[PDB]
Write a protein that binds this ligand. Structure first.
Ligand code: HEM
Ligand SMILES: CC[C@H]1OC(=O)[C@H](C)[C@@H](O[C@@H]2O[C@H](C)C[C@H](N(C)C)[C@H]2O)[C@@H](C)C[C@@H](C)C(=O)/C=C/[C@H]1C
Length: 396
């Protein structure tokens, strides 16, 4: 294949990518394509292959195995679990797994609940009963929850959305590259602000751990860590809520069910993950040796992107794919990945989302999408699945 150019494929490829992915799936598992941003990457589509690869060791996420160059501003924060393999990935993750167990996170419900609640109160405050569920709840919830955890003074949180934006499609490649340096700068400063202040938040914990013994957690790794624990639960958990809602609000029949019975909540918040999950394609993976993806051979060092979005629509795994059913069997979706890199914060995310949906359906009479689905606009970025905004309204 000449190599499918995603860029020149319409701002609707950001809208409904699926047909393009499926079309590829039909011809084979792997495909070379140029991303809307440029660079050459491989796309692995089709559920069975997707799941498979995610856990395949031959696909290392350690940039040392990539033949793609890394700018200095990037090289800075590339010492985290999601960008390394054993033994390093093993070593690092261990450092903070106890902080994200369903049991531990559950302890945060009281707080998370209160955080959502405060946010909803302010929403219903509007006189016309119209607000953007994005800047109104979906965005502020994640960034707060996590920021109290990692210990980010609140005034400091604004610059974060700013950067994340640049990271995702920014209106200029050199601008996002600035956001990274800027962030590294902040985090590094912040890391130090903690030293000797006997704080008990996660970050303070790590700063102590790292000092006590640098062989267990290097200074770069310390940086990388704080960075990854932050920017990995953003775009994802923030769009989870948005996508989730946009999904439930554009399928009245389903909104109805959940309204009638709220026990379907957990299972509905799951189908959201399957149907319109936040991550379109898993993060970068590089073959340590050439991999023969059935007929198609991928060179060592090339960038492989497992397309979570497509596997979720592969009809041989998920019948009536494009159908948003909250009573569906969502068992086995790749929303949070598969393998050793399986989301470390799946519990924290789920909690937030579950409390978030819960709130809305409840505290919002005649809640509804405030614009037509065709009017919404998604982010061109091929690695994410987010709405520019999500208008709504409710019985004034
Ligand atoms: C809707 C929410 C979330 C989604 C969709 C999501 C999705 C994922 C996915 C797909 C991976 C694996 C990526 C890959 O292998 O390419 C992953 C990894 C990870 N996630 Fe999440 N995530 C979410 C929320 C969270 C939260 C709330 C945190 C932070 C507290 C978090 C922290 C991480 C980290 C640091 C990893 C590294 C895993 C490892 O390498 O062992 N995630 N997540
Ligand atoms: C967990 C899935 C999302 O990706 C991420 O959370 C990671 C942290 C991040 O990718 C990293 O971004 C850094 C700024 C640079 C780093 N590079 C030095 C190696 C890179 O690996 C994303 C948050 C980037 C943004 C743009 C995004 O939208 C991610 C979506 C998920 C893949």
């Amino acid at each position: 294949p000449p190599v499918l150019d995603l860029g020149a494929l319409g701002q609707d490829f950001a809208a409904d990518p699926y047909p393009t992915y499926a079309r590829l799936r039909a011809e084979g598992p792997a495909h070379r394509v140029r991303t809307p941003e440029g660079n050459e990457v491989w796309l692995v589509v089709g559920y069975d292959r997707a799941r498979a690869v995610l856990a395949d060791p031959r696909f290392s996420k350690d940039w040392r195995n990539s033949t793609t160059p890394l700018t200095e501003a990037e090289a800075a924060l590339n010492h985290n679990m999601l960008e390394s393999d054993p033994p390093r990935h093993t070593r690092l993750r261990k450092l903070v797994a106890r902080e994200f167990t369903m049991r531990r996170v559950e302890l945060l419900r009281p707080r998370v609940q209160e955080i959502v609640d405060g946010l909803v109160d302010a929403m219903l405050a509007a006189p016309d009963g119209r607000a953007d569920l994005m800047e109104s709840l979906a965005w502020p919830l994640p960034i707060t929850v996590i920021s109290e955890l990692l210990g980010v003074p609140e005034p400091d949180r604004a610059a974060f959305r700013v950067w994340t934006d640049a990271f995702v499609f920014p209106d200029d490649p050199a601008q996002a590259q600035t956001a990274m340096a800027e962030m590294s700068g902040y985090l590094s400063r912040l890391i130090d602000s903690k030293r000797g202040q006997d704080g008990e938040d996660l970050l303070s914990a790590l700063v102590r751990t790292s000092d006590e013994d640098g062989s267990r957690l290097t200074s770069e790794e310390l940086l990388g860590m704080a960075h990854i624990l932050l920017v990995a639960g953003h775009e994802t958990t923030v769009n989870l809520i948005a996508n989730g809602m946009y999904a439930l609000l554009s399928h009245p029949d389903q909104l109805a069910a959940l309204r009638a019975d709220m026990t379907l909540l957990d299972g509905a918040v799951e189908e959201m993950l399957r149907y319109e999950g936040p991550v379109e394609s898993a993060t970068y993976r590089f073959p340590v040796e050439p991999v023969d993806l059935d007929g198609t051979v991928i060179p060592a060092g090339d960038t492989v992107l497992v397309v979570l979005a497509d596997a979720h629509r592969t009809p041989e795994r998920f019948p009536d794919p494009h159908r948003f059913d909250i009573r569906r069997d969502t068992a086995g979706h790749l929303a949070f990945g598969h393998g050793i890199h399986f989301c470390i914060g799946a519990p924290l995310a789920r909690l937030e989302a579950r409390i978030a949906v819960r709130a809305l359906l409840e505290r919002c009479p005649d809640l509804a999408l405030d614009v037509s689905p065709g009017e919404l606009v998604w982010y061109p970025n091929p690695m994410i699945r987010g709405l520019k905004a999500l208008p709504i309204r409710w019985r004034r």
